[PDB]
Amino acid sequence: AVKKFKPYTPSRRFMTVADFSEITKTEPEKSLVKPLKKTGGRNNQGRITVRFRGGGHKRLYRIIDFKRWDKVGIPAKVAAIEYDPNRSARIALLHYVDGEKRYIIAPDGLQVGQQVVAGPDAPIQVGNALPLRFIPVGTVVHAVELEPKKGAKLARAAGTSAQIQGREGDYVILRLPSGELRKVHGECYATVGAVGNADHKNIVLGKAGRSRWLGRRPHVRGAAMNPVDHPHGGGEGRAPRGRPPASPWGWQTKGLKTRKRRKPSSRFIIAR
Amino acid sequence: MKRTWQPNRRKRAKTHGFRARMRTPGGRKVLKRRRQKGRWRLTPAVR
RNA sequence: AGCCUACGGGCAGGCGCCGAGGGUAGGGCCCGUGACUGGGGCGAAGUCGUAACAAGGUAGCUGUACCGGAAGGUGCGGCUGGA
RNA sequence: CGCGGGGUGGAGCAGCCUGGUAGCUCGUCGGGCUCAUAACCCGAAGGUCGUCGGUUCAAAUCCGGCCCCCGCAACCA
RNA sequence: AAUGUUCA
RNA sequence: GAGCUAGCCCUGGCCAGGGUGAAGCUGGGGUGAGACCCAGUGGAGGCCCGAACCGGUGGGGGAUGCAAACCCCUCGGAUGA
RNA sequence: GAAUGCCGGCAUGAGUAACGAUAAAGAGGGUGAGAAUCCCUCUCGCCGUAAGCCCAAGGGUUCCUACGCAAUGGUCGUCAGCGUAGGGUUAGGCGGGACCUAAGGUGAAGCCGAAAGGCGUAGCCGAAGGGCAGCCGGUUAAUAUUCCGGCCCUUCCCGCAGGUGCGAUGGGGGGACGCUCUAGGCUAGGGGGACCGGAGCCAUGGACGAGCCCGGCCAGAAGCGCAGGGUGGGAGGUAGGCAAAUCCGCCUCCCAACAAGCUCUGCGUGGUGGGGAAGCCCGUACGGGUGACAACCCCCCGAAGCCAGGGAGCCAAGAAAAGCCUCUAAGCACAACCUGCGGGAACCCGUACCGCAAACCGACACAGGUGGGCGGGUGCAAGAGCACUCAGGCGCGCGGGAGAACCCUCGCCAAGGAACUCUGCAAGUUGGCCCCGUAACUUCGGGAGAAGGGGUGCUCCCUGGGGUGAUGAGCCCCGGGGAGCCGCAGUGAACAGGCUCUGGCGACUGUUUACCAAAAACACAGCUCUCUGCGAACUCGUAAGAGGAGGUAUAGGGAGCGACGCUUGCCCGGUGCCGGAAGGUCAAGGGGAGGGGUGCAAGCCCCGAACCGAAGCCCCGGUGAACGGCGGCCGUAACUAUAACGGUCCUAAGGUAGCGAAAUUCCUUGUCGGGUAAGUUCCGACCUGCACGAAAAGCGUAACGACCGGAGCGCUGUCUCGGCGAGGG
RNA sequence: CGAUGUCGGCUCGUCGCAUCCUGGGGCUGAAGAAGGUCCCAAGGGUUGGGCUGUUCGCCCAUUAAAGCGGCACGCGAGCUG
Ligand SMILES: [Mg+2]
Ligand SMILES: [Mg+2]
Ligand SMILES: [Mg+2]
Ligand SMILES: [Mg+2]
Ligand SMILES: [Mg+2]
Ligand SMILES: [Mg+2]
Ligand SMILES: [Mg+2]
Ligand SMILES: [Mg+2]
Ligand SMILES: [Mg+2]
Ligand SMILES: [Mg+2]
Ligand SMILES: [Mg+2]
Ligand SMILES: [Mg+2]
Ligand SMILES: [Mg+2]
Ligand SMILES: [Mg+2]
Ligand SMILES: [Mg+2]
Ligand SMILES: [Mg+2]
Ligand SMILES: [Mg+2]
Ligand SMILES: [Mg+2]
Ligand SMILES: [Mg+2]
Ligand SMILES: [Mg+2]
Ligand SMILES: [Mg+2]
Ligand SMILES: [Mg+2]
Ligand SMILES: [Mg+2]
Ligand SMILES: [Mg+2]
Ligand SMILES: [Mg+2]
Ligand SMILES: [Mg+2]
Ligand SMILES: [Mg+2]
Ligand SMILES: [Mg+2]
Ligand SMILES: [Mg+2]
Ligand SMILES: [Mg+2]
Ligand SMILES: [Mg+2]
Ligand SMILES: [Mg+2]
Ligand SMILES: [Mg+2]
Ligand SMILES: [Mg+2]
Ligand SMILES: [Mg+2]
Ligand SMILES: [Mg+2]
Ligand SMILES: [Mg+2]
Ligand SMILES: [Mg+2]
Ligand SMILES: [Mg+2]
Ligand SMILES: [Mg+2]
Ligand SMILES: [Mg+2]
Ligand SMILES: [Mg+2]
Ligand SMILES: [Mg+2]
Ligand SMILES: [Mg+2]
Ligand SMILES: [Mg+2]
Ligand SMILES: [Mg+2]
Ligand SMILES: [Mg+2]
Ligand SMILES: [Mg+2]
Ligand SMILES: [Mg+2]
Ligand SMILES: [Mg+2]
Ligand SMILES: [Mg+2]
Ligand SMILES: [Mg+2]
Ligand SMILES: [Mg+2]
Ligand SMILES: [Mg+2]
Ligand SMILES: [Mg+2]
Ligand SMILES: [Mg+2]
Ligand SMILES: [Mg+2]
Ligand SMILES: [Mg+2]
Ligand SMILES: [Mg+2]
Ligand SMILES: [Mg+2]
Ligand SMILES: [Mg+2]
Ligand SMILES: [Mg+2]
Ligand SMILES: [Mg+2]
Ligand SMILES: [Mg+2]
Ligand SMILES: [Mg+2]
Ligand SMILES: [Mg+2]
Ligand SMILES: [Mg+2]
Ligand SMILES: [Mg+2]
Ligand SMILES: [Mg+2]
Ligand SMILES: [Mg+2]
Ligand SMILES: [Mg+2]
Ligand SMILES: [Mg+2]
Ligand SMILES: [Mg+2]
Ligand SMILES: [Mg+2]
Ligand SMILES: [Mg+2]
Ligand SMILES: [Mg+2]
Ligand SMILES: [Mg+2]
Ligand SMILES: [Mg+2]
Ligand SMILES: [Mg+2]
Ligand SMILES: [Mg+2]
Ligand SMILES: [Mg+2]
Ligand SMILES: [Mg+2]
Ligand SMILES: [Mg+2]
Ligand SMILES: [Mg+2]
Ligand SMILES: [Mg+2]
Ligand SMILES: [Mg+2]
Ligand SMILES: [Mg+2]
Ligand SMILES: [Mg+2]
Ligand SMILES: [Mg+2]
Ligand SMILES: [Mg+2]
Ligand SMILES: [Mg+2]
Ligand SMILES: [Mg+2]
Ligand SMILES: [Mg+2]
Ligand SMILES: [Mg+2]
Ligand SMILES: [Mg+2]
Ligand SMILES: [Mg+2]
Ligand SMILES: [Mg+2]
Ligand SMILES: [Mg+2]
Ligand SMILES: [Mg+2]
Ligand SMILES: [Mg+2]
Ligand SMILES: [Mg+2]
Ligand SMILES: [Mg+2]
Ligand SMILES: [Mg+2]
Ligand SMILES: [Mg+2]
Ligand SMILES: [Mg+2]
Ligand SMILES: [Mg+2]
Ligand SMILES: [Mg+2]
Ligand SMILES: [Mg+2]
Ligand SMILES: [Mg+2]
Ligand SMILES: [Mg+2]
Ligand SMILES: [Mg+2]
Ligand SMILES: [Mg+2]
Ligand SMILES: [Mg+2]
Ligand SMILES: [Mg+2]
Ligand SMILES: [Mg+2]
Ligand SMILES: [Mg+2]
Ligand SMILES: [Mg+2]
Ligand SMILES: [Mg+2]
Ligand SMILES: [Mg+2]
Ligand SMILES: [Mg+2]
Ligand SMILES: [Mg+2]
Ligand SMILES: [Mg+2]
Ligand SMILES: [Mg+2]
Ligand SMILES: [Mg+2]
Ligand SMILES: [Mg+2]
Ligand SMILES: [Mg+2]
Ligand SMILES: [Mg+2]
Ligand SMILES: [Mg+2]
Ligand SMILES: [Mg+2]
Ligand SMILES: [Mg+2]
Ligand SMILES: [Mg+2]
Ligand SMILES: [Mg+2]
Ligand SMILES: [Mg+2]
Ligand SMILES: [Mg+2]
Ligand SMILES: [Mg+2]
Ligand SMILES: [Mg+2]
Ligand SMILES: [Mg+2]
Ligand SMILES: [Mg+2]
Ligand SMILES: [Mg+2]
Ligand SMILES: [Mg+2]
Ligand SMILES: [Mg+2]
Ligand SMILES: [Mg+2]
Ligand SMILES: [Mg+2]
Ligand SMILES: [Mg+2]
Ligand SMILES: [Mg+2]
Ligand SMILES: [Mg+2]
Ligand SMILES: [Mg+2]
Ligand SMILES: [Mg+2]
Ligand SMILES: [Mg+2]
Ligand SMILES: [Mg+2]
Ligand SMILES: [Mg+2]
Ligand SMILES: [Mg+2]
Ligand SMILES: [Mg+2]
Ligand SMILES: [Mg+2]
Ligand SMILES: [Mg+2]
Ligand SMILES: [Mg+2]
Ligand SMILES: [Mg+2]
Ligand SMILES: [Mg+2]
Ligand SMILES: [Mg+2]
Ligand SMILES: [Mg+2]
Ligand SMILES: [Mg+2]
Ligand SMILES: [Mg+2]
Ligand SMILES: [Mg+2]
Ligand SMILES: [Mg+2]
Ligand SMILES: [Mg+2]
Ligand SMILES: [Mg+2]
Ligand SMILES: [Mg+2]
Ligand SMILES: [Mg+2]
Ligand SMILES: [Mg+2]
Ligand SMILES: [Mg+2]
Ligand SMILES: [Mg+2]
Ligand SMILES: [Mg+2]
Ligand SMILES: [Mg+2]
Ligand SMILES: [Mg+2]
Ligand SMILES: [Mg+2]
Ligand SMILES: [Mg+2]
Ligand SMILES: [Mg+2]
Ligand SMILES: [Mg+2]
Ligand SMILES: [Mg+2]
Ligand SMILES: [Mg+2]
Ligand SMILES: [Mg+2]
Ligand SMILES: [Mg+2]
Ligand SMILES: [Mg+2]
Ligand SMILES: [Mg+2]
Ligand SMILES: [Mg+2]
Ligand SMILES: [Mg+2]
Ligand SMILES: [Mg+2]
Ligand SMILES: [Mg+2]
Ligand SMILES: [Mg+2]
Ligand SMILES: [Mg+2]
Ligand SMILES: [Mg+2]
Ligand SMILES: [Mg+2]
Ligand SMILES: [Mg+2]
């Protein structure tokens, strides 16, 4: 239900806004254990590391429950679907029968007023978390942990999802969103189902102002610089790079792989 | 137009203050040299 | 401010609305013409190739899509106006 | 004017570097196949090597001088 | 495994 | 040495006055149900004209100047990067 | 005797330029030795969303008063922001600190680093932010929300009096938050008034009249009244709020669903306190007295301000901690906490003055720059614009003459209107509001203020809506209709688009070379390639560590192209990148065939070939939205001409689509056609592209542009071709 | 080279003659007019536009003529850029 605008002014006929119908009447956030002061910054102690960062609207970091093994066997009731400006996906407010209030990365199809649980039993239903060794092979899963007892770290973006291909001893083969086949331990929890907000890929920023609102500064091309500032820079009008394309630091940016060859995690990867 | 000197008691006392000099070896050597030379004002006068 | 034959009237005259036409400006239809360009019809004996009619020597035709000096070729699907 | 590459049968290319013998394709001529042409098959002719010289016993081949053709360069104020 | 100028 | 300047961080402030009338709502129309069409309502946008404000397009003057970047006329933006 | 030598002094230009905005001065009197320049008075000119008031930064004696003018003041100066001396800045309520946290800084624990030192959860510091109890008048020459007067508050400490289990830096709530648009009632502010209060006035032809002119408020506890914000109330169970709670949270019933009720603001009213014009008389450098027993009332407009944490829409999703309430634990229930009343205690710093400027920043009394609040009245539709003008403040610290050239700024002009010139550069036309009326084209929004027009003042009469008013008079907004008057001219002055046609480039709003370039350059949404499995890739750092990111392939880094429509062809021979457990080579190392130097000797010391030896290179493949490249010579068609066609050489392949004398074309003002009287420019075509061409993108495209080129219309001193006048020199 | 500002235009001229015109003259294949060529002569005059930065040049309408050249390819302490 992607929202479109009329061409009453330029940069609007193409501007696109995501559908906010899934967001229930819960515009304000929660507290006691919820958004904390988010320290916005574009650099480390001193100089800038990640270039072209800054500006952007002010935000509050919604603390999410990535390690859902803290309340094993305890049910929960989905009471709301909120907006998180720090993530591409939607968050969900949970009210455990136990008494706590934590946010889970709202998966796709998860509606308000639904029971959810995490643990060994944990019936196979959208939103439930189980160890990978318990989930049936061929089911879509998200929020997978890399190593056990380290929190959810894989397939947690808008619309992303992983699939179980098979088991091997204490490890299970997972088809990550990038198509890479990975061996993940069986004790790593993972929330079954997709993530949702698949329309996030169809959104169109429209104008540069929307990019500035998101905190993305105008990226300057290397060819539009000087040789002191970039390897492609310099030369007379529109030089065709005159050399293999490279980054401002020298390393090439066209097919040059940069993964550490001698890595202990190499014997766990099967695909690209 | 706007010139380079825009007085500020706060900035002047924090950037050229006596405590700031003692915090770094550079400022310490600055005070050392000024003492050796016999300066009447080892640090900028701030009221 | 005039003239009158019956004058709380008329005439001449003055002002106003409309008003043919002229001017200004901008649209709509049609007609002629225009360097150049597109394909078309016709034109006894010009060049290149063989597409089709006999399984025309790759069955032919067709809608579409792409490519090719050119007929045309190929892909997808359809037809018997073929076996 | 300058720099470097080429002038070879009728057409297009080698052969030059390391001198002795000029080959490839097309084309032309004669004869085959066809009813006739093309295609194809069998034989053969065809070259003052741009020219003027000199080095050698000897020059397409090596060295000079001119006649053409091809490309590059002709900037600074 | 191509082709057969024009009219009768 | 970032009391100028460039960028970023935290915290505050400012932007007179006019227009254009997007979405959405309500009613009516339409259909088997819709799409959709009319009004009325509604006030969106790096929207429009134009002050404060931020600039610096073209001309003139200034040239041991008012000024080691100025003054006059004109000009761009002016709820947004 | 020279070095554009150094330091100092004095010459020249020279009594020349200038004397710092063209807002403006004139006169009488006084002081004084000396007044254009100091003081007073009268006339005149200027500002007035300021050139007027109030804070903040900065400045530091500049403020007041007395006595002075050698120097500072662009002249004088009796004057001063200058010298000498004296005086002057009063706080529990204003601001900051004995309160809080943010960026950030620091930093016990801890980590890192040759040393210096770097990082770092807790805590600490860290302020126009949070929290927090004062309003109105009088006084000095100089201080006031500080002193005084009135009224009203806040902390503590000690007591009594009544209640409750009190009780923590601990748990919970709360504090607490975006942008835009708005509702109801108020208040600030302002307009009017036949009502009220006033010293006075009849001028010059008329006016004793609802005549003229001035003024008709401020604050104010409880108690009221009017708006408005917050807030559901009980009974059970509970595993969570890192110990425990009656508190919070989660379930299950019963009543509210409402502001009904509790508190909490704002505003009127209120015991009472204060102020009170214009004019005249005075002596000031200025204020005093009277005016006064002042009166202190009624309408209308009305905020951007208040009730505030109000409401609604939207996406980009909008600080923390303390104060505050509540809950319980240690310990203690002789303690303690809440309320009322008494008595008592309440510190440290600033307070003068300038403060859009002569006191700050610019070496200067510099036409420059400098944050926040108030910023009135009338009219022009509106308004912080414009013109004039309250309050208030100035005439800019050299003047007096004259009426040349010439210069700046400004006005007007016969006839012609771009003939000027690189170009209509400049200047001129137009110009606001209301109503008609608007084309090709298009992304259906636009283009559109298209273009081109008409009305615009004043008077009289008739008539329709509202708002405050009781369904009414008035008062304030909006209209409509008909008669008439004047002038050359009715947004009668000031503020206020010239317009169209057609190309190049760029999609567009934006950004940049402060101090010569604002663009076709950069950026931009969007497309594509590539890398990156999370201790990610990349980046800063020797490291620790941090950013990425408290993000996870719809995410993040790099690169190119730059909306959008249609597209983006061939070559992997070379370079790069990617994939290849084969093979060649390949250093340290293993390894010892064999040899050497010394010893009488065991020995010790050297070299040292086979063979095993990674990366890398060679080798084998892929990959162009990777770096790059994408032919030559001949002949041919039944008029010529050209070549659909063929031959041959080479290459890795031999530029297709779409454009083309173009931001690209040397020859070149190529050749035709159009605009013109005439056109090296411009526009449309031809194609012979020296030397376009497909993401250093190609061909187009509505809209957009202080970009660049051409044309036309309207208009004009640009010009023929000058002339006159105004002010500043 | 411890500086001689270099194109073109505007303003201001001035000079040379081997003269565009006007004045005088001689031949002519000069009947006359109108021409051709040559000699003497500069006193004076030698237009306005379109294109281009132009000098130059090509056109438009004329003219008695629409001359050539020097003066730092005259002239920027005169201007334009
Ligand atoms: Mg809390
Ligand atoms: Mg830090
Ligand atoms: Mg630091
Ligand atoms: Mg870019
Ligand atoms: Mg550059
Ligand atoms: Mg640098
Ligand atoms: Mg650098
Ligand atoms: Mg480089
Ligand atoms: Mg450069
Ligand atoms: Mg180039
Ligand atoms: Mg380059
Ligand atoms: Mg009668
Ligand atoms: Mg056939
Ligand atoms: Mg067939
Ligand atoms: Mg066939
Ligand atoms: Mg094919
Ligand atoms: Mg088929
Ligand atoms: Mg050859
Ligand atoms: Mg050869
Ligand atoms: Mg034969
Ligand atoms: Mg040079
Ligand atoms: Mg050079
Ligand atoms: Mg044939
Ligand atoms: Mg700064
Ligand atoms: Mg700063
Ligand atoms: Mg508005
Ligand atoms: Mg509507
Ligand atoms: Mg609006
Ligand atoms: Mg705007
Ligand atoms: Mg605009
Ligand atoms: Mg504007
Ligand atoms: Mg303001
Ligand atoms: Mg500024
Ligand atoms: Mg700028
Ligand atoms: Mg300017
Ligand atoms: Mg410009
Ligand atoms: Mg200028
Ligand atoms: Mg000058
Ligand atoms: Mg404009
Ligand atoms: Mg604007
Ligand atoms: Mg000497
Ligand atoms: Mg000397
Ligand atoms: Mg000198
Ligand atoms: Mg000298
Ligand atoms: Mg002298
Ligand atoms: Mg004199
Ligand atoms: Mg002189
Ligand atoms: Mg003089
Ligand atoms: Mg003078
Ligand atoms: Mg002055
Ligand atoms: Mg006297
Ligand atoms: Mg301050
Ligand atoms: Mg101060
Ligand atoms: Mg003093
Ligand atoms: Mg004084
Ligand atoms: Mg005195
Ligand atoms: Mg003096
Ligand atoms: Mg003295
Ligand atoms: Mg003096
Ligand atoms: Mg001075
Ligand atoms: Mg005296
Ligand atoms: Mg003094
Ligand atoms: Mg104390
Ligand atoms: Mg504090
Ligand atoms: Mg604290
Ligand atoms: Mg603190
Ligand atoms: Mg901190
Ligand atoms: Mg140490
Ligand atoms: Mg540190
Ligand atoms: Mg810290
Ligand atoms: Mg403190
Ligand atoms: Mg504070
Ligand atoms: Mg505060
Ligand atoms: Mg206070
Ligand atoms: Mg005072
Ligand atoms: Mg007071
Ligand atoms: Mg008091
Ligand atoms: Mg208690
Ligand atoms: Mg307490
Ligand atoms: Mg009032
Ligand atoms: Mg009144
Ligand atoms: Mg009265
Ligand atoms: Mg009288
Ligand atoms: Mg009041
Ligand atoms: Mg309850
Ligand atoms: Mg507990
Ligand atoms: Mg209610
Ligand atoms: Mg009151
Ligand atoms: Mg009250
Ligand atoms: Mg009084
Ligand atoms: Mg008085
Ligand atoms: Mg609200
Ligand atoms: Mg909090
Ligand atoms: Mg604390
Ligand atoms: Mg409370
Ligand atoms: Mg103390
Ligand atoms: Mg004071
Ligand atoms: Mg004060
Ligand atoms: Mg101010
Ligand atoms: Mg000043
Ligand atoms: Mg100053
Ligand atoms: Mg000073
Ligand atoms: Mg000073
Ligand atoms: Mg002055
Ligand atoms: Mg100014
Ligand atoms: Mg300002
Ligand atoms: Mg106002
Ligand atoms: Mg006003
Ligand atoms: Mg009027
Ligand atoms: Mg008004
Ligand atoms: Mg107006
Ligand atoms: Mg205001
Ligand atoms: Mg004004
Ligand atoms: Mg006054
Ligand atoms: Mg005239
Ligand atoms: Mg006239
Ligand atoms: Mg005209
Ligand atoms: Mg002209
Ligand atoms: Mg013209
Ligand atoms: Mg001319
Ligand atoms: Mg021109
Ligand atoms: Mg032009
Ligand atoms: Mg102009
Ligand atoms: Mg006018
Ligand atoms: Mg238009
Ligand atoms: Mg147009
Ligand atoms: Mg329209
Ligand atoms: Mg109009
Ligand atoms: Mg009138
Ligand atoms: Mg009212
Ligand atoms: Mg009413
Ligand atoms: Mg009229
Ligand atoms: Mg106007
Ligand atoms: Mg144009
Ligand atoms: Mg062009
Ligand atoms: Mg642009
Ligand atoms: Mg384009
Ligand atoms: Mg722009
Ligand atoms: Mg610049
Ligand atoms: Mg510069
Ligand atoms: Mg400029
Ligand atoms: Mg610009
Ligand atoms: Mg695109
Ligand atoms: Mg660093
Ligand atoms: Mg490093
Ligand atoms: Mg990190
Ligand atoms: Mg992070
Ligand atoms: Mg990416
Ligand atoms: Mg990216
Ligand atoms: Mg580009
Ligand atoms: Mg299109
Ligand atoms: Mg390509
Ligand atoms: Mg290749
Ligand atoms: Mg390769
Ligand atoms: Mg290969
Ligand atoms: Mg490799
Ligand atoms: Mg070895
Ligand atoms: Mg060894
Ligand atoms: Mg190897
Ligand atoms: Mg022929
Ligand atoms: Mg061929
Ligand atoms: Mg091709
Ligand atoms: Mg062409
Ligand atoms: Mg070209
Ligand atoms: Mg023509
Ligand atoms: Mg032409
Ligand atoms: Mg053309
Ligand atoms: Mg190109
Ligand atoms: Mg390319
Ligand atoms: Mg482009
Ligand atoms: Mg194009
Ligand atoms: Mg266009
Ligand atoms: Mg522009
Ligand atoms: Mg355009
Ligand atoms: Mg003139
Ligand atoms: Mg004159
Ligand atoms: Mg004058
Ligand atoms: Mg020189
Ligand atoms: Mg010299
Ligand atoms: Mg002569
Ligand atoms: Mg003659
Ligand atoms: Mg004669
Ligand atoms: Mg004759
Ligand atoms: Mg003669
Ligand atoms: Mg020349
Ligand atoms: Mg001459
Ligand atoms: Mg010359
Ligand atoms: Mg010259
Ligand atoms: Mg000059
Ligand atoms: Mg010049
Ligand atoms: Mg000179
Ligand atoms: Mg130039
Ligand atoms: Mg210029």
Numbering used by the authors:
A (entry chain RD): 2 to 273
B (entry chain R7): 1 to 47
What text does the study give?
Here, we solved a 3.7-Å structure of the 70S-G299A ribosome containing ASLLeu (anticodon: 5′-UAA-3′) paired to UUC, that is, with a C–U mismatch at the third (wobble) position of the codon–anticodon helix. Watson–Crick interactions form between the first and the second positions of the codon–anticodon interaction (U4-A36 and U5-A35; mRNA-anticodon nts; mRNA nts numbered as +1 starting with the P-site mRNA codon). At the wobble position, the distance between U34 and C6 is too great to allow any hydrogen bonding. Monitoring nts A1492, A1493 and G530 rearrange to dock into the minor groove of the codon–anticodon helix, with inward rotation of the 30S shoulder domain towards the 50S subunit and the 30S platform. The base triple interaction between 16S rRNA nts A160, C342 and G347 is disrupted due to h14 widening. In the corresponding near-cognate structure, G347 and C342 form a canonical Watson–Crick base pair similar to that observed in wild-type 70S. Overall, the structures of 70S-G299A mutant ribosomes bound by either cognate or near-cognate ASL closely resemble each other. Mutation G299A is located in h12, ∼50 Å away from the 30S A site and ∼80 Å away from B8. Here, we solved X-ray crystal structures of these mutant 70S ribosomes in the absence of an A-site tRNA and in the presence of a near-cognate A-site anticodon stem-loop (ASL). Both mutant ribosomes adopt the closed (on) state when either cognate or near-cognate tRNA occupies the A site.
